[PDB]
């Protein structure tokens, strides 16, 4: 009778056909292009889209001026506008159906760190985040999956406690300084 939660869901779905050449082609394109690490990472962005998409289609069965459909619709649109996937010109919920997996990987904090020009490559960008270099409003984000909001995009920069910012010089430089002083005398 313990005071625990147990509530947990999966974030991905494994595809039906495991060896579709055209699927293995397109998913490895997405991984290499946006610098992911496994097929589960594409499958979970695909499942977040499919949930949004399933919700959107459920609202399209309901008649216009249905208070559930207006409230739930405007909420789902506002949620997609906030995360910077859907434009403010396109906040009608028949444009959510015309929406692709690439647009959510564009808002990945790995891909934003790359596209804001404070990382050299998409693979460098993951290293920086995973080695807790970057911050989002004086909050060190360690995790590259951080879906950056449209509200929260320009406040991405290096952490104050990182040597790529105004930070203490790292372990290698400090050993190479001690080596340089050890060699001379």
């Amino acid at each position: 009778p313990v005071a625990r939660s147990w509530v947990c869901r999966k974030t991905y779905v494994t595809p039906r056909r495991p060896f579709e050449k055209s699927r293995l082609d397109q998913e490895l394109k997405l991984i290499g292009e946006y610098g992911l690490r496994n097929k589960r990472e594409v499958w979970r962005v695909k499942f977040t889209l499919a949930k949004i998409r399933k919700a959107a289609r459920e609202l399209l069965t309901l008649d216009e001026k249905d208070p559930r459909r207006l409230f739930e619709g405007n909420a789902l649109l506002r949620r997609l506008v906030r995360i910077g996937v859907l434009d403010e010109g396109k906040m009608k919920l028949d444009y959510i159906l015309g929406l692709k997996i690439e647009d959510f990987l564009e808002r990945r904090l790995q891909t934003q760190v790359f596209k804001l020009g404070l990382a050299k490559s998409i693979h460098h960008a993951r290293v920086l985040i995973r080695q807790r270099h970057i911050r989002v409003r004086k909050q060190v984000v360690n995790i590259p999956s951080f879906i950056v909001r449209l509200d929260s995009q320009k406040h991405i920069d290096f952490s104050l406690r990182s040597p790529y910012g105004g930070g203490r010089p790292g372990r290698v430089k400090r050993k190479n300084a001690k080596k340089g002083q050890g060699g001379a005398g």
Partner: protein, 124 residues
């Protein structure tokens, strides 16, 4: 360079305390001990450090901010009256029995055997 703000401030007239959420900025350096928090809260509210009980700090990830709960009592007797006895014991002015509960269980069950004044003759 340790800044300490107070947040969600309340005055329990019914427990004879101030109670608030302590918000400690300390970028670059370690989680500061409770002794520096108490001594800064003391001069923050112009009170003795002995009446200030400060606990429950969880440092945010990154570590330029910790949030804990503090409370400033009116007197020393008010502190020792209506405070958890374990949180007094961080200040050394509560000491509890040395015995672990298994001895006290087995003692009780041995005392349940004998009737009359012989229950004092179980131990010693």
């Amino acid at each position: 360079t340790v800044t300490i703000r107070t947040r969600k401030f309340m005055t329990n007239r019914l427990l004879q305390r101030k109670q608030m959420v302590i918000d400690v900025l300390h970028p670059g350096k370690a989680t500061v001990p409770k002794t520096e928090i108490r001594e800064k809260l003391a001069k923050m509210y112009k009170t003795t450090p002995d009446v200030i009980f400060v606990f429950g700090f969880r440092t945010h990830f990154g570590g330029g901010k910790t949030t804990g709960f503090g409370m400033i009592y009116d007197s020393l007797d008010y502190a020792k009256k209506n405070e958890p006895k374990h949180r007094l014991a961080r200040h050394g002015l509560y000491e509890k029995k040395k015995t672990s509960r298994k001895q006290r269980k087995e003692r009780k069950n041995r005392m349940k055997k004998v009737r009359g004044t012989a229950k004092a003759n179980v131990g010693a």
